[PDB]
Each structure stands twice: as C-alpha cells, then as structure tokens.
Ligand binder design. Structure first.
Ligand SMILES: O=S(=O)(CCO)c1ccc(-c2ccc(C3CCCC3)c([C@H]3C[C@H]3c3ccccn3)c2)cc1
Length: 235
C-alpha cells in the first residue's frame, strides 16, 4: 500500500514484543518520578558522550479508552491543544489514512542548538494475542529519511522512536445497557528513545526530561479526559 508498510510492521512488533514488559520488578530501570499511577522510569545511556536515556512510563487513566487516547495523540489537528514544546510543525507526506510523515521543530533548550525531527507517525489496532488478552491500540512515531526535509540551519536533527501503547479494561455490559465511562480504565505504556543528534550537556537534558515527560503525560491525559467527557465512548 506504501513503501513503509514493512518498516511500520517491524517497528510496531518490536514495541509489542519488548516495550510492554513490566519494569516495576526490574532494577535496570530507574524510577525517576512518581505521581499517583504515573510512573516514569529511565536508563542512563550515552553514546559518544551524547545522552540517549531510554524513557519508559506507565499510567492508568480513568474514563477514556485506548482508541480515544491514541486518536488524540495521533491527530495533528489537536496537536496545539496539548503540545507545549513544538515551535513549528509541517505534514510532509500522507502515506495512508493511518500514517503520515511529519517535520517539527522543538523549542530551543539552552545552551544546546535547537532540534528538529522528521518522523513517520502511525496509528494501529493490534488484536489480542489470545482470547485472554486485551486488544492494543498503539501510536508509533519513528524517524525516517525524506527528500522534502526542510533546510533549517538553526536546528540539529534529532532522531526518535516513540510509542504510546494502550490497553483498556472495562466492566462487562449488564444485559442491554452501555458501559459507563465510570467503569473504563486505560492502561498506558509510553516509551521514548530520543537521540539528540549531536552535542548537548548531559545534566541539562536529564533535568529537562525529568520535568517535561511527566508534565506531558499529565497534560495530555487530562486533555483526553476533558475532551471525551459526556461524549459517547469510542471503543
Ligand atoms: O511523544 S512524541 O512523539 C509527541 C510528538 O511530538 C515526542 C516527545 C518528545 C520528543 C523530544 C524531542 C526532542 C528532545 C530534546 C532532544 C535534544 C533537545 C530537545 C526531547 C527531550 C527533551 C525531552 C522532552 C520531553 C517531552 C517534550 C519535549 N522534550 C524530546 C519528540 C517527540
């Protein structure tokens, strides 16, 4: 259907295989911030003195479904309502109704150069592995090469591999009666592997990650709750 179908499959399947694992029991992940059910972990990793620190967070959001969370995360039309670190954004290519390529710039983090990013953003539903397991909605955003990448001399090109992975638990329907948002919970695993693509001071990037990832998860999840309240559920 498009030239990135196989790459998309590999990237999604890699998150399904490796990103969903629990890390509460795993001393190799450092728990850096906890705010209720929001648990943010990282590993301290540098390659050539540049911070790569894999980030992984879990959260549990009442009253929204994974399909809703993923749609709001993927939909570029609502990006401005919840993003706080983007300066500019351009849709570079549409590949499918569920997959686009995006160019964006982030606000400068002093004293490093501003960063830009060029990535494929795809939204997929993954069927239950067995009839015991939940279905998964996943958004994966991962860097790719493209010819219609802008010249932007202020920016160093970062590379990313991010996934927002959601499983939704509900009270079953009681005969002919809908499920209430009161009885729905969206379990989130969010992972972010960012390569700043060049020099940046490690302590500054680590301090920024520690602040901004929790702020993002809080703001974004609250936004989804706020926008879906009193609207019919989209499972
Ligand atoms: O979840 S998404 O796919 C949503 C679509 O945007 C996502 C989230 C985060 C990033 C990102 C990009 C650049 C940086 C660094 C690299 C050197 C200088 C800036 C960081 C580190 C600094 C951390 C951070 C966390 C949250 C928001 C912004 N900043 C993060 C990209 C995409």
């Amino acid at each position: 259907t498009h030239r990135f179908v196989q790459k998309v499959e590999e990237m999604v399947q890699n998150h399904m295989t490796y990103s969903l694992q629990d890390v509460g029991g795993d001393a190799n992940w450092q728990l850096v911030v906890e705010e209720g059910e929001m648990k943010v972990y990282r590993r301290e990793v540098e390659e050539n003195g540049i911070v790569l620190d894999p980030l992984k967070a879990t959260h549990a959001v009442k009253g929204v479904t994974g399909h809703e969370v993923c749609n709001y995360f993927w939909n570029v039309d609502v990006r401005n309502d919840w993003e706080t670190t983007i300066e500019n954004f351009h849709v570079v290519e549409t590949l499918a109704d569920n997959a686009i390529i995006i160019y964006q710039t982030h606000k400068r983090v002093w004293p490093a150069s501003q960063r830009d990013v060029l990535y494929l953003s795809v939204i997929r539903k993954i069927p239950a592995l067995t009839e015991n397991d939940p279905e998964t909605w996943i958004v994966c955003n991962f860097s790719v090469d493209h010819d219609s990448a802008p010249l932007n001399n202020r920016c160093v090109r970062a590379k990313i591999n991010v996934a927002m992975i959601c499983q939704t638990l509900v009270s079953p329907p009681e005969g002919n009666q809908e499920i209430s948002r009161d009885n729905i919970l969206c379990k989130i695993t969010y992972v972010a592997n960012v390569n700043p693509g060049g020099w940046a001071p490690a302590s500054v990037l680590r301090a920024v990650a520690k602040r901004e990832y929790p702020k993002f998860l809080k703001r974004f999840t609250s936004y989804v709750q706020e926008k879906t309240a009193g609207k019919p559920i989209l499972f």
